[PDB]
Amino acid sequence: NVKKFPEGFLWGVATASYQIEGSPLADGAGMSIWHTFSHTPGNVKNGDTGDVACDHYNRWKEDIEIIEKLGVKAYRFSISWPRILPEGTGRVNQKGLDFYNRIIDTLLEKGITPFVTIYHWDLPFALQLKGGWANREIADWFAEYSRVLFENFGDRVKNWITLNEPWVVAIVGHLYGVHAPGMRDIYVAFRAVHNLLRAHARAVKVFRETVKDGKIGIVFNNGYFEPASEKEEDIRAVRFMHQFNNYPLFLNPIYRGDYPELVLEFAREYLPENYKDDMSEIQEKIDFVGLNYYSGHLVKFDPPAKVSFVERDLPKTAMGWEIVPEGIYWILKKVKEEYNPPEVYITENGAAFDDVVSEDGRVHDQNRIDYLKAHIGQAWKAIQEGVPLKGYFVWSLLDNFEWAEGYSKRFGIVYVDYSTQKRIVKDSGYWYSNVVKNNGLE
Numbered sequence: 001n002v003k004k005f006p007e008g009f010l011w012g013v014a015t016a017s018y019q020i021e022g023s024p025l026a027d028g029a030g031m032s033i034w035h036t037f038s039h040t041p042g043n044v045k046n047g048d049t050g051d052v053a054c055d056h057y058n059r060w061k062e063d064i065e066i067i068e069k070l071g072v073k074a075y076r077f078s079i080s081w082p083r084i085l086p087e088g089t090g091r092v093n094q095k096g097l098d099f100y101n102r103i104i105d106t107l108l109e110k111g112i113t114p115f116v117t118i119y120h121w122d123l124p125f126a127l128q129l130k131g132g133w134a135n136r137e138i139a140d141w142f143a144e145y146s147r148v149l150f151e152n153f154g155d156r157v158k159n160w161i162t163l164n165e166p167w168v169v170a171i172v173g174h175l176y177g178v179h180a181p182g183m184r185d186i187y188v189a190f191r192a193v194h195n196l197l198r199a200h201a202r203a204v205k206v207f208r209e210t211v212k213d214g215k216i217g218i219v220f221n222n223g224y225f226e227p228a229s230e231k232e233e234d235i236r237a238v239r240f241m242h243q244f245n246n247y248p249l250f251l252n253p254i255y256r257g258d259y260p261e262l263v264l265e266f267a268r269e270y271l272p273e274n275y276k277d278d279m280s281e282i283q284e285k286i287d288f289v290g291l292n293y294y295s296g297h298l299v300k301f302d303p304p305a306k307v308s309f310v311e312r313d314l315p316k317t318a319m320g321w322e323i324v325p326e327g328i329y330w331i332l333k334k335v336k337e338e339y340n341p342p343e344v345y346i347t348e349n350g351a352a353f354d355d356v357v358s359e360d361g362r363v364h365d366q367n368r369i370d371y372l373k374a375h376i377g378q379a380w381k382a383i384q385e386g387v388p389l390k391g392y393f394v395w396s397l398l399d400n401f402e403w404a405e406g407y408s409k410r411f412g413i414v415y416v417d418y419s420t421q422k423r424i425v426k427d428s429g430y431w432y433s434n435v436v437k438n439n440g441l442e
């Protein structure tokens, strides 16, 4: 019944710069790849872009006041690299720093803990013209950007995330071409894997030199994969998927100094020739792992990657994603088993549903409450069995720009009416507000 969480526990909400801010070119900001990608015809559902989004660039104080009012203790947000360095390196844009300075000061004043994601997918367009994640030099560009953030904010911000979901950045951005920069080349995609690791390790290195009382980690996407059958090949296709799609792709290098075994079987041809020379620097020690989780997937060997998904009955979200709450427990347990990081946070968990405002003026998203409650329950369980889970972040505070899905997927615990920019706290937000005050369930 009563599920009480440890005394430190960070109850959070999460967003990302391009998904909420709008005004991408205000105050001397450079273009990002998401600006140019979403302005290209055919890339994003309905032609949506981040031009306006939630207009958080102007409504930031109101949004933080919502966090405060809700009593949420932690806010995960990201910094737009091209607001800070419009050409990606070199010149620093003081007006960009001032924007994030105001948010950071406001959160602190109100006793909310800022968790800053350095990179959440809005690469400066000027760097994409030099190859972006494909170019080894990005490890230097990233290091320089990080240094600027640390020097300017590291006095007040003490919790930092280098990369958001590097699997997505590499594979969805450069192999599937579904996300910026919209490329479909498997050799580029694995070079981007590798460069993401090198840039992450370089930023951690600079962090130790500039923020000596801080903590820094990295965030990965994960699915709960289960075999279709009990056949050998099926259980194996599952071991491939976990190793490729989940945290091992990056944590195997960071903790063991090489890519996971089945990843090398499939992908050694696509990785740079002497990639191993980079591994010792890649092992730079991190303070925490962020794990994201939304769903589970039935999979079977199928004679690309030799793997297919099979649709299951099971309730789904508006994303079409299977609701499998024990996934979050499984992934929490697995991460302890495989690499034993000293701290873990759930950095994303949530759901998209076809929310509507009822005539009573409220959003009755019982479907999201049920979703959040089940998963918070599974994360509690993991804590009872010794996973050092220190925090939990709902994706998202606000309905926002859902990348190639545009505004048509609503993940917020607060509804946004895009025609007026009005915020409506959903039932799920009130519910979560109660969970945070009680520090856990029922």
Ligand SMILES: *[C@H]1O[C@H](CO)[C@@H](O)[C@H](O)[C@H]1F
Binding pocket: 016, 019, 164, 165, 292, 348, 395, 401, 402, 403, 411
């Ligand atoms: C994690 O997933 C959510 C929902 O798909 C995205 O909107 C975030 O940007 C990503 F970080």
